[PDB]
Scaffold this active site. Structure first.
Site, mmCIF file in Angstrom:
data_model
loop_
_atom_site.group_PDB
_atom_site.id
_atom_site.type_symbol
_atom_site.label_atom_id
_atom_site.label_comp_id
_atom_site.label_asym_id
_atom_site.label_seq_id
_atom_site.Cartn_x
_atom_site.Cartn_y
_atom_site.Cartn_z
ATOM 1 C CG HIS A 102 -15.732 -12.880 -38.483
ATOM 2 N ND1 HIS A 102 -15.993 -11.530 -38.568
ATOM 3 C CD2 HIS A 102 -16.096 -13.252 -37.231
ATOM 4 C CE1 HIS A 102 -16.483 -11.103 -37.419
ATOM 5 N NE2 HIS A 102 -16.556 -12.128 -36.591
ATOM 6 C CG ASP A 154 -15.834 -9.756 -41.320
ATOM 7 O OD1 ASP A 154 -15.377 -9.583 -40.172
ATOM 8 O OD2 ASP A 154 -16.546 -10.736 -41.630
ATOM 9 N N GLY A 186 -19.598 -11.982 -29.765
ATOM 10 C CA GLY A 186 -20.988 -12.378 -29.643
ATOM 11 C C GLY A 186 -21.868 -11.379 -30.378
ATOM 12 C CB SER A 198 -19.048 -10.729 -34.793
ATOM 13 O OG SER A 198 -17.854 -10.398 -34.101
HETATM 14 C C1 497 Z 1 -14.154 -19.499 -32.204
HETATM 15 C C2 497 Z 1 -14.726 -18.137 -32.568
HETATM 16 C C3 497 Z 1 -14.324 -17.761 -33.984
HETATM 17 C C4 497 Z 1 -14.606 -18.724 -35.146
HETATM 18 N N1 497 Z 1 -13.578 -18.508 -36.173
HETATM 19 C C5 497 Z 1 -13.379 -17.139 -36.678
HETATM 20 C C6 497 Z 1 -13.627 -16.040 -35.660
HETATM 21 C C7 497 Z 1 -13.228 -14.727 -35.975
HETATM 22 C C8 497 Z 1 -13.580 -13.700 -35.101
HETATM 23 C C9 497 Z 1 -14.401 -13.917 -33.986
HETATM 24 N N2 497 Z 1 -14.834 -12.801 -33.320
HETATM 25 C C10 497 Z 1 -14.536 -12.541 -32.044
HETATM 26 O O1 497 Z 1 -14.257 -13.470 -31.322
HETATM 27 C C11 497 Z 1 -14.542 -11.125 -31.564
HETATM 28 C C12 497 Z 1 -13.813 -10.821 -30.381
HETATM 29 C C13 497 Z 1 -13.803 -9.524 -29.837
HETATM 30 C C14 497 Z 1 -14.497 -8.473 -30.486
HETATM 31 C C15 497 Z 1 -14.365 -7.140 -30.048
HETATM 32 C C16 497 Z 1 -15.020 -6.076 -30.709
HETATM 33 C C17 497 Z 1 -15.030 -4.726 -30.106
HETATM 34 N N3 497 Z 1 -14.043 -4.319 -29.329
HETATM 35 N N4 497 Z 1 -16.013 -3.883 -30.297
HETATM 36 C C18 497 Z 1 -15.699 -6.344 -31.921
HETATM 37 C C19 497 Z 1 -15.797 -7.666 -32.391
HETATM 38 C C20 497 Z 1 -15.202 -8.743 -31.693
HETATM 39 C C21 497 Z 1 -15.234 -10.068 -32.218
HETATM 40 C C22 497 Z 1 -14.741 -15.243 -33.630
HETATM 41 C C23 497 Z 1 -14.254 -16.314 -34.409
#
Ligand code: 497
Length: 245
Positions: free
Chosen positions: A46, A97, A196, A198
């Site tokens: 992703h 993923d 951030g 991921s």
């Molecule tokens: C614009 C960002 C984008 C691009 N297109 C697909 C996509 C898809 C997804 C993410 N990931 C996240 O934004 C995200 C948010 C919160 C999270 C919380 C946890 C956690 N609670 N530990 C783990 C991973 C996370 C990832 C970002 C994007």
């Protein structure tokens, strides 16, 4: 990473900082990754599905800060970006993923192991750690959900694995979490990974060996009550990893 402690790359030798070049030349941090072998980094699909061009990506190893050249680092480009062909994304959950990036330096060489650049071992078939085990995560993700900027220094924290039947309870994720995923979190819900981080490593000490058990994939919010972080179960994908490398 919410809460936790700062650290330096010498403590996380297999962590990979993945950046992306923009139009005009500006460069921004994207996701984390883990060094599997000298020529390979494994992350989350992703993180790249929206801009699937291997040329725009930059990969660093042995880099301890967001905008500083750390003594000993190595800069790389991506020789090959392979994405899992059956990947998809629902409202919260992400499927298959997982991604592979074959790296290469300008001279055409893969990574050269040193004190700050090391590989982490993959898990073996059907052998994951029991629920309740403590494991660590690292990343340059938000320290708080309200921040828009990422921490300048690398951070890490420790969380506990959660059973599949517990992660499927109503107040958690129900049937949204499948057997190909692993949940982990802080019992008091003060620390956790966040946007951030991921693509980053979920490492677990298994039978005396540091093992890349998970890859940061998704979750509802960051460090929220009854909302664990969800990670790609690596052991399940061994056949795929082997065939594509
Ligand atoms: C614009 C960002 C984008 C691009 N297109 C697909 C996509 C898809 C997804 C993410 N990931 C996240 O934004 C995200 C948010 C919160 C999270 C919380 C946890 C956690 N609670 N530990 C783990 C991973 C996370 C990832 C970002 C994007």
């Amino acid at each position: 990473i919410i809460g936790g402690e700062f650290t330096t790359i010498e403590n996380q030798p297999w962590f990979a900082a993945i950046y992306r070049r923009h139009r005009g030349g500006s460069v921004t941090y994207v996701c984390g990754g883990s060094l599997m072998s000298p020529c390979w980094v494994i992350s989350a699909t992703h993180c790249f599905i929206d801009y699937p061009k291997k040329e725009d990506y930059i990969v660093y190893l042995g880099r301890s800060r967001l905008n500083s050249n750390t003594q000993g680092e190595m800069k790389f480009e991506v020789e090959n970006l392979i994405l899992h062909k059956d990947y998809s994304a629902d409202t919260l959950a992400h499927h298959n993923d997982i991604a592979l990036l074959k790296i290469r330096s300008k001279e055409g060489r893969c990574a050269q192991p040193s004190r700050t650049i090391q590989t982490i071992c993959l898990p073996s078939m059907y052998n994951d750690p029991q629920f309740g085990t403590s494991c660590e995560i690292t990343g340059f993700g938000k320290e708080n959900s309200t921040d828009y900027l990422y921490p300048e220094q690398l951070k890490m924290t420790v969380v506990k694995l959660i059973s599949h039947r517990e992660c499927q309870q109503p107040h958690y994720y129900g049937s949204e979490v499948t057997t190909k995923m692993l949940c982990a979190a802080d019992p008091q819900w003060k620390t956790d990974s966040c946007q951030g981080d991921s693509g980053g490593p979920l490492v677990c000490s298994l039978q005396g060996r540091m093992t890349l058990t998970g890859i940061v994939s998704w979750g509802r919010g960051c460090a929220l009550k009854d909302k664990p972080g969800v990670y790609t179960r690596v052991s399940h994908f061994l056949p795929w990893i082997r065939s594509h490398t």
